[PDB]
Amino acid sequence: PEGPELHLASQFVNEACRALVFGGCVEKSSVSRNPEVPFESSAYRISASARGKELRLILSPLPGAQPQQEPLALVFRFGMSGSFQLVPREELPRHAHLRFYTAPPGPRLALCFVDIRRFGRWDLGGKWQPGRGPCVLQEYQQFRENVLRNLADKAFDRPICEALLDQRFFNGIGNYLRAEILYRLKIPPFEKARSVLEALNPDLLELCHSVPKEVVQLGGKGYGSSGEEDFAAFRAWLRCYGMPGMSSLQDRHGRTIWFQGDPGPLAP
DNA sequence: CGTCCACGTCTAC
DNA sequence: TAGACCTGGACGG
Structure with missing residues (x-):
């Protein structure tokens, strides 16, 4: 989902x-x-x-x-x-x-x-x-603009891990995609969103598109895939979300964020 | 038996 | 910023 x-x-x-x-x-x-x-x-x-x-x-x-x-x-x-x-x-x-x-x-x-x-x-x-906001898979350019033209929004005062769930700017990203996105760039989940985004190889807004796009290319059912075939593919694709060796913490809404290393400055 | 946990919004205090 | 909304799998005693 x-x-x-x-x-x-x-x-x-x-x-x-x-x-x-x-x-x-x-x-x-x-x-x-x-x-x-x-x-x-x-x-x-x-x-x-x-x-x-x-x-x-x-x-x-x-x-x-x-x-x-x-x-x-x-x-x-x-x-x-x-x-x-x-x-x-x-x-x-x-x-x-x-x-x-x-x-x-x-x-x-x-x-x-x-x-x-x-x-x-x-x-x-x-x-x-x-x-x-616009779809990160199918309307990338609009998605990227809508984020950059709006960094003053109070949404961006939050941790980048909580900001990535906000569907007004990241329509499409859920709990597994955030951990996977953040982990590809090693961004601490608890950096402030606006600091990671103001700055404006793939950067974080590009990974919001091509990351979910990689799951689409596995075909199958993605997260919904255990008799498997579909399921083994998806679990093999995940580097971070739920993986052994990783850390996890609750954000301010009680959702679990997986990551590696530094939790980042705004951590509970 | 029981507790915790899960791919997300919603409305209501 | 807390809850509410729900079922069922994993796992504990």
Whole structure:
């Protein structure tokens, strides 16, 4: 449920649904506090795109589909466990909170948003969350500008490790990517953000892009990968997050920051 | 049995 | 700046 996983999940929706046609209603599990998706069409296609830590699905009726229905966009945040699966209609995983059903010619499948802790959220309406900065994978240049044009923001008074989670400037970076980013440059996690950034080979804002981009290139499921294949690849990619020999500390919100060496000046 | 820990926001005091 | 929101795996007694 960081930027690489959101991005992988959107490619997964795009490839796995390339040749599917969905039909009928969009079904929500009983226990989910998210809104119902008012949307029905007898033949519709599903596509996605990611931005940062959000993913957007577009439901698009084929020509002639019934009820009349305009394209609908839904935006998902994954929380600590969100994911998508394509499964056989009658073999729904345990926590499938939102389900999309294929239509006949072929075997009956269900595309499901699966989310065990239910920190995930979706919204009707298709807009990115106001306030999230640009995507570090897909909008690098905008991402880099939005940080540099704004170093006066009180966000940058904080440790660089806490600033890297702030989605207003680092949309996409989560807890493993911060430790990996910081570790490639050996920046103490508790340096003040503004000092590391004012200054303006790869620097820290470049690593915010190419680091998550390396996870995307492993393919697979990234953090969400243990039967493995996917999983062994990811765990082999990590140099820092949770590794033996590393230090860790809690930041001011209780999140664990892995690192090596100097904790840096603002440490608890 | 029990405690801790996990890829993140949110709202409310 | 504390909590709340949740399930389940690892591991302890």
